[PDB]
Amino acid sequence: ASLIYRQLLTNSYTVDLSDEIQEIGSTKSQNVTINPGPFAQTGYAPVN
C-alpha cells in the first residue's frame, strides 16, 4: 500500500506539464518600470 506514496513522489514531473497547461490558459499582462526617486522640485518662473 506504500506504493501510493512511492508513485506519487516518483511521477511528479507531470506536475510541470499540468502547470504549463494552466499557464497557456492564463491571461498574461506586463508591467513597465516605475520612475523612482526624490523628483526635483521645479516650479513656475518669475513672471509679471
Binding site: 506586463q30 508591467n31 513597465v32 518600470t33 516605475i34 520612475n35 521645479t42
Partner: protein
Amino acid sequence: KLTRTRLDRLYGLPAADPNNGKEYYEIAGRFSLISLVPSNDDYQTPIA
C-alpha cells in the same frame, strides 16, 4: 529726401523701399530657449 515735397534730409526708413532690392536681411544669431519639455526618462517601458 523726397523730391517735390517739403521733407529734406529726413531720417527713418519709409513705407516705399526699405528692402532696397536686398536679397534678404541675413541676421545670424544664437538662441537659448529654456522650456519645460516632456520626458519619461528611460522608464515607463516594458521591464524586458
